[PDB]
Amino acid sequence: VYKVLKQVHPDTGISSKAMGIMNSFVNDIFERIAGEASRLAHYNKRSTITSREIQTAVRLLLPGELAKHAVSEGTKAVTKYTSSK
Amino acid sequence: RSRKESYSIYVYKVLKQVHPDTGISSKAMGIMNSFVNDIFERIAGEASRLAHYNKRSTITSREIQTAVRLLLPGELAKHAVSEGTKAVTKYTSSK
Amino acid sequence: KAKSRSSRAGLQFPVGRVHRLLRKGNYAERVGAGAPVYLAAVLEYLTAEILELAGNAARDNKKTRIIPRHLQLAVRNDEELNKLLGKVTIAQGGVLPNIQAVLLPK
Amino acid sequence: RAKAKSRSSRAGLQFPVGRVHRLLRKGNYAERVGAGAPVYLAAVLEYLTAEILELAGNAARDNKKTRIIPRHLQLAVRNDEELNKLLGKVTIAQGGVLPNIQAVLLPKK
Amino acid sequence: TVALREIRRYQKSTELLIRKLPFQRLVREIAQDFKTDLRFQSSAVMALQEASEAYLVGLLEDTNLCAIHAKRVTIMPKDIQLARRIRGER
Amino acid sequence: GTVALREIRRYQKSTELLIRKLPFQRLVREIAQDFKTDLRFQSSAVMALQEASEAYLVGLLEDTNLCAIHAKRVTIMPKDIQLARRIRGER
Amino acid sequence: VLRDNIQGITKPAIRRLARRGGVKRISGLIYEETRGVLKVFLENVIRDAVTYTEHAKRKTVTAMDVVYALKRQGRTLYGFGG
Amino acid sequence: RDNIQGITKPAIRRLARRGGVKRISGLIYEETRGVLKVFLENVIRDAVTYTEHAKRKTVTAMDVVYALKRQGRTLYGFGG
DNA sequence: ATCAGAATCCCGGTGCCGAGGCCGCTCAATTGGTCGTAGACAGCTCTAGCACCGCTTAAACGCACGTACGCGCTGTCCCCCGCGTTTTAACCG
Numbered sequence: 001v002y003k004v005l006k007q008v009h010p011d012t013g014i015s016s017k018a019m020g021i022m023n024s025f026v027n028d029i030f031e032r033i034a035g036e037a038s039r040l041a042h043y044n045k046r047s048t049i050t051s052r053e054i055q056t057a058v059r060l061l062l063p064g065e066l067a068k069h070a071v072s073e074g075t076k077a078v079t080k081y082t083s084s085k
Numbered sequence: 086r087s088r089k090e091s092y093s094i095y096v097y098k099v100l101k102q103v104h105p106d107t108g109i110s111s112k113a114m115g116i117m118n119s120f121v122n123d124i125f126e127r128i129a130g131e132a133s134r135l136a137h138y139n140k141r142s143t144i145t146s147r148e149i150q151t152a153v154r155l156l157l158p159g160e161l162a163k164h165a166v167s168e169g170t171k172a173v174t175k176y177t178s179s180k
Numbered sequence: 181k182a183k184s185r186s187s188r189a190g191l192q193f194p195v196g197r198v199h200r201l202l203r204k205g206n207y208a209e210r211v212g213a214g215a216p217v218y219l220a221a222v223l224e225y226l227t228a229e230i231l232e233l234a235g236n237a238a239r240d241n242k243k244t245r246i247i248p249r250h251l252q253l254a255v256r257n258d259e260e261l262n263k264l265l266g267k268v269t270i271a272q273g274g275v276l277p278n279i280q281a282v283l284l285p286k
Numbered sequence: 287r288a289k290a291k292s293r294s295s296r297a298g299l300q301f302p303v304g305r306v307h308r309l310l311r312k313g314n315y316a317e318r319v320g321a322g323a324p325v326y327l328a329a330v331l332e333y334l335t336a337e338i339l340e341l342a343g344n345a346a347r348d349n350k351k352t353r354i355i356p357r358h359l360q361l362a363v364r365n366d367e368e369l370n371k372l373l374g375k376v377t378i379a380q381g382g383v384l385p386n387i388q389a390v391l392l393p394k395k
Numbered sequence: 396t397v398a399l400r401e402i403r404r405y406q407k408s409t410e411l412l413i414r415k416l417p418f419q420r421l422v423r424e425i426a427q428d429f430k431t432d433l434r435f436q437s438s439a440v441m442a443l444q445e446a447s448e449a450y451l452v453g454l455l456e457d458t459n460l461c462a463i464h465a466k467r468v469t470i471m472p473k474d475i476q477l478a479r480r481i482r483g484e485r
Numbered sequence: 486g487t488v489a490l491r492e493i494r495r496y497q498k499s500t501e502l503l504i505r506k507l508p509f510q511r512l513v514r515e516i517a518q519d520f521k522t523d524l525r526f527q528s529s530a531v532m533a534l535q536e537a538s539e540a541y542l543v544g545l546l547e548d549t550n551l552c553a554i555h556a557k558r559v560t561i562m563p564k565d566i567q568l569a570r571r572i573r574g575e576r
Numbered sequence: 577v578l579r580d581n582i583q584g585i586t587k588p589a590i591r592r593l594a595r596r597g598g599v600k601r602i603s604g605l606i607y608e609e610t611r612g613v614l615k616v617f618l619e620n621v622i623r624d625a626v627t628y629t630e631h632a633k634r635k636t637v638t639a640m641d642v643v644y645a646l647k648r649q650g651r652t653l654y655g656f657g658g
Numbered sequence: 659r660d661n662i663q664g665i666t667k668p669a670i671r672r673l674a675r676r677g678g679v680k681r682i683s684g685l686i687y688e689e690t691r692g693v694l695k696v697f698l699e700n701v702i703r704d705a706v707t708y709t710e711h712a713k714r715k716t717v718t719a720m721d722v723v724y725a726l727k728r729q730g731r732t733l734y735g736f737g738g
Numbered sequence: 739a740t741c742a743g744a745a746t747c748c749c750g751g752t753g754c755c756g757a758g759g760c761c762g763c764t765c766a767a768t769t770g771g772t773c774g775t776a777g778a779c780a781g782c783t784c785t786a787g788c789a790c791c792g793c794t795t796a797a798a799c800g801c802a803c804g805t806a807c808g809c810g811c812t813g814t815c816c817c818c819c820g821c822g823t824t825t826t827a828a829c830c831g
Contacts, residue, residue, distance in 0.1 A: 002758095003300075004300050004332075004336070005339060008336070008339070008340070009339070009340075009343050011352060012343055012346070012352065012353050012354055013352070013353035013354070013757095013758090014353065014354050014757095015756085015757060016756075016757055016758090017356070017736050017756095017757090018354060018355075018356065018359070019757095020719075020735075020736045020737040020738050021356065021359075021378065021734050021735075021736065022335065022734075023737075023738040024723055024734040024735055024736075024737075024738040025376075025734045026331055026335070027723075027738055028376075028723075028727065028732055028734065029331070029334075030306060030309070030327065030331070031134075031137065031727075033327065034137075034309075034310060034313065034315055035130060035133060035134065035315070036648075037315075037323075038133060038207075038315040038316060039126065039130065039644075040631050041205070041316060042126075042129070042201065042205050043631075043632070043640070043644075044631060044632040045204060045205070046205075046316075046776085046777075047204065047205060047206035047316060047317070047318060047775095047776065047777095048316065048318040048319070048320065048775095048776060048777065049310070049315075049316050049318075049319045049320060049323050050320050050322075050323065050777070050778095051320065051322045051323055051326065052631060052633075052777095053323065053631065054323040054326050054327060055326065056627070056628075056630055056631040058326065058327075058330050059627055059630075060624060060627050060628060060645075060648070061372075062334075062372065063368050063371070063372065064623055064627075066368070070329075070330055070333060073329070073333070074326050074329050074330070077297045077298055077299070077325075077329055078297060078322060078325065078326075080297065080298065081293075081296050081297035081298075081325070084296070087783090095192060095193050095194065096227055096231075098192050099192060099224070099227065099228070099231075100231070102192075103231075104235075107244055107245070107246070108246070109246045110245070110246065110247060110248075112248060112656070113246055113247060113248050113251070115654075115655055115656035115657070116248050116251065116270075116654050116655070118656075118658075119643060119654040119655060119656070119657070119658035120654060121223065121227075122640075122658055123643075123647070123654070123658065124223065124226070125219075125223070128219050128222075129201065132211075132215065132314075133207070133313070133314055133315055135711070136208065136211075136313065136314035137309070137312075137313035137314060137315065138720075138724055139711065139712055140312060141314065142208060142209075142210055142312060142314060143208075143210040143211075144208075144210070144211055144212065144215060144314070145213070145214050146214055146218065147711060148711070149214075149215045149218050149219065150218070151707060151708075151711045153218070153219075153222050154707055155704070155707065155728060157222075157226075158260065159703065165221070165222055165225060168221075169218055169221060169222075172217070172221070173214070173217075173218075176189070176217075205316075206316060206317050206318065206776095207314055207315065207316065207317075208314035208315075208317060209317055210314075211314060247409075249409055259576070262574065262576075263574070263575070266573070266574025266575065267574060267650045267651065267652070267730075268651075268652055268653070269449045269450070269452075269453040269653070270449065270653065270654070271445040271446075271448055271449040271653060272409045272411075273449065273452065273453070274405070274406065274409070274452070274596060274597075275406070275456070275596070275597065275598065277406050279402065282463050283398070283399075283402065283598065284399075288768080288769050288770080289768095289769090290767075290768040290769055291768080292767080292768090293767095293768085302767080303767085304766070304767045304768085305766085305767090307767090308766075308767085318775095318776080350748080355500065356500065357498075357500045371484075374483055375730075375731055375732060376731075376732055376733055376734060377537075377540045377541075377544070377733070378540075378734070379500070379533075379536035379540065380499060380500040380501075380536070380539075380540070381540045381543055381544070382497060387490065387493075388554065390554055390558065390559075391486070391487075391489075391490050391554075391559055391680055392486070392487050392490065393486055393487055393558075394558070398600065401595065402596075402598075405595075405596040412589045412592055412593060413589055414797095417584060417585075417586075418585075420578070420581070420584075421581055421584055421585065421618075422622065423578075423788075423789095424578055424579060424581055425618070425619065425622055426622055426626060426637075428579075429622070429623060429626070430626060432635075433626065433635055433636070433637070434635050434636035434637070434786095434787050434788080435636060435637045435787080435788095436636055436637055436638060436639060436786085436787080437786080437787085438639045438655070438656050438657055439625075439637045439638065439639050439641075439642045439657075441655065441656070442639055442642055442643065442653065442655035442656070442657070443621070443622075443625075443642060445653055445655060446621075446646060446651070446653040447614075447618070448593070449653050450617075450651065451590055451593060451614075452593050452596070452597060455590070455593060455594040455597040455599060456597050456598075457572045458594075458597075458599065459594070459597050459598045459599050460568060460571075460572065461552065461555060461568070461572075462599070463598075464552075464555070464556070464564065464565075464568055465555045465556050465557075467807080467808080468599065468600045468601060468806085468807075469600070469601040469602065469603060469806090469807065469808070470599070470602065470603065470606065471603060471605070471606070471808090472603070472605050472606050472608070472609045472610075473555070474555065475606065475609060475610060475613075476609070477551055477552060477555065478572060479613070480548070480551070481548040481551075481552070481569055481572060481573055482572075482573060484617075484651075485613070486680055486681070486819075488744070488745070488819095488820090489675065489680045489819085490680070491744085491745055491746070492675045492745075492746090493675060493676065493678070493680070494745095494746075495745070495746055495747090496672065496675050496676030497676060498746085498747075499676070503669065503672065503828090504665070504669065504828070505828080505829080506828065506829060506830090507827065507828050507829080508664055508665075508827090508828075509664070511660075511664060512661070512664040512665075512698070513698065513702065515661055515664075516695075516698055516699060516702050517702055517706075520699075520702055520703055520706050521706050521710075521715070523715065524706070524715065524716060524717075525716050525717075526717065527717070527718060527719060527722075529719055529735070529736040529737055530717065530718070530719050530722045530735065530736075532736065533719070533722060533733075533735035533736050534698075534701070534722065537726065537733050538694065538697065538698070539673060541697070542673045542677055542690070542694075543673065543676055543677040543678075544677070545677075545693075546673060546674055546677030546678055546679045546690075547677050547678035547679075548678075549678075549679060550674075550677070550678030550679040550680065551678065553679070553681070559680045559681045560681045560818095561679055561681050561682055561683055561686050562683065562686075563683070563685045563686060563689055566686065566689050566690070566693075567689075570693075575693075578789095586797090586798060586799090587798095588797080588798060588799085589797095589798090600806085600807095601806080601807075603808095633778085635787095636786090636787070650730075681818075681819090682818080682819095683817090683818075684817095684818090
């Protein structure tokens with residue numbers, strides 16, 4: 001946190017109120033995604049959150065085109081993660 | 086698992102205990118089954134939410150009572166909590 | 181025979197049906213157990229309330245059959261029930277049999 | 287010696303995976319959680335935060351201010367129609383909207 | 396004068412005025428247009444047509460309520476936009 | 486009514502609170518005691534509640550104003566709020 | 577034709593249900609926007625509902641998935657399944 | 659008394675001067691005030707229950723956030 | 739269309755109190771082995787999924803005459819806006 005923002009925009013300051021605002025925002029987003037994944041696991045009788053659970057929850061959450069691009073980037077990133085060392 | 090579980094049959098049993106002559110229609114039967122399943126999932130989600138938030142890695146009685154209080158209006162849930170506390174104490178005391 | 185909790189607890193609603201979820205769903209390592217009876221009682225009493233409200237609504241039209249139209253009428257006559265499901269509308273709702281002055285003639 | 291690294295970084299991310307993984311396990315949702323799924327969550331969260339911060343920064347530069355404020359965040363949210371579709375259930379302090387005023391408010395002559 | 400008769404008749408009946416086969420066909424076409432070769436349940440189609448029917452009758456009741464509020468019966472597209480904007484889905 | 490739209494624009498740019506310490510404070514304090522006495526409220530939380538209340542008020546009043554434009558020219562009425570609330574589902 | 581059925585959905589039925597809703601007259605500019613936004617809403621509903629079903633490695637869209645998708649959308653309706 | 663006067667007339671007039679409404683009325687202020695009591699009472703009651711489950715009797719920022727998330731229309735407060 | 743007036747939009751100086759940032763630490767993040775366990779893929783039962791058909795016609799679509807109302811102008815009065823002045827209280831400390 002904050003390190004990434006200074007890398008991409010060194011000339012923009014930010015108050016702690018905004019940092020708390022985005023912290024609560026990501027808290028709510030994580031809570032909603034985790035709850036939706038848990039419900040999807042209950043519906044399909046699952047005791048382990050795998051890639052498909054979170055992928056379906058993410059595509060369900062954001063709109064289609066951006067979700068498709070995001071999961072494509074995630075696929076290329078996870079192939080890079082598993083292939084490199 | 087192959088047997089299609091339905092939850093309207095329990096409502097039917099209570100209905101037969103009260104007024105077995107009259108009853109519900111097929112579409113209405115589907116409606117109450119969907120309502121029962123939706124309320125069932127909502128209270129499960131409420132328990133999950135409370136358990137996550139308060140770092141509550143358990144759920145005995147207070148947690149689900151708070152879930153009932155959150156789900157339902159204040160006065161009706163308070164009366165339900167009172168009879169539920171009495172029932173759970175009686176059940177533990179009886180054995 | 182086989183001593184199930186239904187007769188001992190005196191409740192027709194299924195007891196371990198929730199236990200199924202708790203066990204196979206593996207929600208936590210400390211979940212439910214006592215939760216079943218609690219939610220079962222709450223659902224039973226709410227279903228009794230809804231059954232009473234639907235029965236009261238049905239008799240207003242001198243008819244003794246249950247239709248989701250009458251469920252919508254009973255719900256929409258309740259402001260608290262409206263606030264519970266304000267972002268919801270049930271099909272076949274239509275309009276009420278009482279007609280306002282705007283539509284009737286002079 | 288083994289290299290104990292943050293598993294998001296090996297996937298090209300920056301958000302630490304440990305806190306969200308611990309929240310998932312301790313949250314009473316499921317006692318077993320895979321490794322790839324919190325990595326996907328971290329990647330999605332990083333991309334969304336970077337996108338909203340970049341759009342807010344561009345709007346702020348258009349707004350003739352060097353630093354971010356909640357008003358610029360509101361304008362950034364209201365600028366994209368899809369963000370109004372999805373993030374319309376949440377607003378931020380002193381909300382705003384594009385000039386959708388009509389021409390019937392002013393007294394007629 | 397026949398408006399009274401129609402109101403009484405439509406209060407006495409509740410038949411689904413949107414037909415299952417055209418809406419089924421529309422759903423099949425649109426679904427296969429987005430993602431090809433996927434099946435759709437008949438019960439899901441019936442539920443979706445019920446949802447659309449409820450949505451439109453609620454929207455039109457709101458439109459009528461806004462009409463009579465502004466001492467009118469016929470309505471303009473602005474009321475529909477109004478209802479969607481207060482609901483916030485637009 | 487014509488300078489009012491200018492004031493609308495002015496208050497549109499404004500991004501600060503209005504009644505935090507002495508007022509809203511006494512309000513939430515009072516209501517808190519009414520439910521359960523001996524309660525307190527974080528200053529940051531107080532600010533967040535005031536901003537949420539004023540943002541929701543802005544949105545709902547904008548909705549009621551656009552519903553009042555349908556009644557010709559410019560004038561609000563109690564029935565405007567009541568109707569809008571019912572339509573949305575709050576009432 | 578099994579394509580280009582945007583004109584297929586009929587306005588008379590919406591008019592008749594509005595008549596059932598009390599409305600005694602409608603306009604021509606109404607359906608121009610109503611049909612477009614109805615098509616947009618239907619597109620979004622079908623998209624998220626079929627997105628919901630994709631989790632369980634299924635090919636057919638089930639009733640409970642559609643009901644829970646509408647529930648997530650905040651415009652839910654109950655039916656046979658769910 | 660001062661419970662209804664906590665928010666003044668020009669305060670609602672400012673909220674209308676930033677909320678679209680160009681023409682206001684006396685009864686409108688009272689209605690908006692009652693809606694405000696309903697909203698505030700709901701949130702404070704939710705917070706009271708949530709701070710009674712953990713036996714604390716005081717709300718923090720996170721408490722307020724969870725209380726307002728229960729209303730459906732969620733909000734993001736300060737801190738967290 | 740055209741000039742003067744009130745409010746507004748951006749900028750400058752100051753109080754400060756919450757923001758920008760240094761350091762520890764400790765409770766959590768990582769790495770490594772087990773292996774029964776739970777998700778992914780081939781197969782049993784069989785249900786309903788995609789598309790069309792015999793037959794009747796209700797209803798969608800296109801078109802004709804006209805009325806309730808869409809939209810605009812006119813009268814009103816009452817009921818809230820504009821502004822000067824006082825108090826009073828909101829934010830400051």
